[PDB]
Structures are given as C-alpha cells and as structure tokens.
Amino acid sequence: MIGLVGKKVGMTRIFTEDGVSIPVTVIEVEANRVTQVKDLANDGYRAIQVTTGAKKANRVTKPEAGHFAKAGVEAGRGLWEFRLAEGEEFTVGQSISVELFADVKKVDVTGTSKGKGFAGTVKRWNFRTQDATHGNSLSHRVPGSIGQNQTPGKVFKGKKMAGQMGNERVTVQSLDVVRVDAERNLLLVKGAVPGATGSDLIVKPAVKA
Template sequence: MSLGLIGKKVGMTRVFTEAGVSVPVSVVHAPANRITQVRTPEVDGYHSVQVTYGDKKPSRINKPISGQYAKTGVKAGRGLSEFRLESMPADSLKVGTELNAALFSVGQKVSVSGVSKGKGFAGPVKRHNFHMQDATHGNSISHRAHGSTGQCQDPGRVFKGKKMAGQMGNVRVTTKNLEVVQIDTEKDLLLIKGAIPGAPGADVIVKPVIASEVNLPSGEEPVTEDVQQEEVAQDAA
C-alpha cells in the first residue's frame, strides 16, 4: 500500500481538453491531512501512517480518541485513517506533518474508496440486472421476480450467495485505475476522470495505484523502474 489522502466528494462536472473533448470528472476536496501517528516495525510490527483531516467539535469526540489527539498535539479531525507502507520514506514523515493535493500529479492513476449510495431493499432486476419475466401470457404478479431459487428435496436448501432481492448499496467500494485530470493546490481540489463511489459530501480515500493493480493486456507484466532505467541506458548507448 502507498500513502494517500482522505477527502470529501463534492460532485461531478466536466473539463475540456485542448482539442475540445469533454471529459467527465469527479471533484474531490482534499484539505490538508494531518499525521497523527507513525507506526514502526520496532513498536507495531509494520510501517504505516495514521492521518486525520477536517475539523470536529471536541464535544463530539469520545475520551480515548480525544486523549490521542491531546497526546500528539494534533488538531482533532473528522476521523482517523491509516495508510500501510512497505517502508518509510527517506524524509521520514513525522507527527503533525501535513499532506495535501500536491502528493499526486496530473496523469497519475489512482484508486478511490468510499461507501456507495444506499438504495434500500431492491429486487433482483435492479440489484443484479436480472431479465424480466413475461409481461402477459399468464404471468400475473411475477414480472420482476427472480424465479427459481434452486432444486427440490436434494439438496433441499438455497445455496449461499444466491442472487436474490435484498439490501442494495451502502457498502465499501473501491474504483481502481482512475486518472487524475487536474489538481488545484490553492483550493485543495482533485479532479479525477470518471465516477467515484459515494454521494456528494461523503468521505473518500484516494491512493496511488500500485503496479500489480494496473490493467494490462493478457500475458504482459508491469514494467518496474529498474527495467525502465535499463532500457533508457540501452537507447542512449
């Protein structure tokens, strides 16, 4: 995992390229993320950075979390999130350091995680894209029903995972390989190509995509930085 940012989904709009092509983008407001804790292998067994962002009334924070903020001297935020790292960066991030939108670059691929919009109790047609049954020909009240749910006495039950009606949405979702189109460091805005999970105003986590998550054609492998440097050296020779 790599270091990312916590932000708030503002909504969607569009931007135009120099060629006049309209590009749909999601706007993420990512104000300065404050580091509240740095975990190390010596103490915790792994590398990670814990951050918070935004503001929250002290009266809305319970005593354990309030004590953690007081111990570190960091202003209380909307919540705490942790980014696990393979190794600590050379500059050694410290408690109180602020991370902003400059962490990303235009054209970079990112993953966005958030809680999807809740749709309530939904039928199989809406929830799982089932085909509708006949509108007539003897069908009375089963137009949007899922039909058979399994066999008879053997096995005598419905298998786990069967697609049926039920709660739709309001689950943790991650959308990968989205491109950063624009960055406004003055307003702390990230413009990301395409749609991202969640309703406007929801918290989202934006992280760089690692090489193993990039969609590549069948049979191809991600090119590492060492291989790229070797190819450049061969071309120069």
C-alpha cells in the first residue's frame, strides 16, 4: 500500500528478445526516510510519512530541525505521507526501496510537480488552427465563442483559454513495472513519469488495476 518518493534520474531503450526494442524510464527509489509515522489518533488515521529530497540541513528552521531530531534524520523541505492496512515501521528510518514493487507488477506513478509551465502546446489545453476559407485573418487560435447565450448557460464552468498548468500531482493510473533491480535500486517503468527531467516524484502502487 505505501507510497515511496522517487527521483526522475535516467531514460533507457532496453531490448527485448523479440524484433522490437522498448524506451523505458529509470527511477532511483532508495532512502524513503521516516521521522514521524502517524497513528489513529494522530489526525485520526494511521499512515506512514517518508522523506526523499535534497537539503544541506545547516540553515533550516528550528521547528523543522527538531521534527527530524527526535526521530530519524532526513533532508528535503517537503515530506509525503500514505495511508495503509499493513504493519507500521519504527520511526527512526527504514529506507525501503524497489522491492515493494514486485509484489504488484503495476505501479501508480503520481508525481509532485509538473515541469512544462503552461502546456498551450496541444497537451493540456488544446487547439485546432482555423482551416482557411475566403481569406481568413487575425484570429486562428483564440477560442471563437466560449459561451453560448443566457439560456444554454452564459459562459459554462470547466473551460480554460489561458492560464497555468497547475504544478499539482498527476496520475497516469496503473502503469506497468517492466523490472525491479536490487544492488543499485533501479525501477524500470515504461514511460509517462510526470514533471521535467531531474524533478522529484511520488511512486505508489496500483489499487485500481
């Protein structure tokens, strides 16, 4: 059940014994570091907090430094937590890795961040250029009529025109594990791992499919 925070690190086209070779994305999932671990009075639900990230920890807010001090030491400004129905671990670090991802042969790679900024590039808010009749001019890509009238529903909810990509955390839901690899902790996931290259992510397991 437990969500393991990875790092986007590597991309490889690996061969398979058939006449096709496969592009794959390579995720280092090592040092998932507990410092809290919640229980079922602590916000009322039992869950496990793990930390994977990059911080010097010399010039660090004292309320944060003591959070790490009384239990497992960690780096990383942000920390992530996950509900479960399994046995909970000791709060001074557990560092559990890629091995979790062989007891299921699918993962949900969930992300942290999103890495494109706007995605007006026919990705998240899409377009078709005006197909040219009679000598079209000025507008080709600004939406023609976003509303309707005051009886269909003026301008309806759930429409974008311009803005931001969001920088939230995005699923592709239930994507395959290609391999798990001990002795250097490599996860082969087949693709669509979110964010720009070198960005952080979350990778939890598949509960749906």
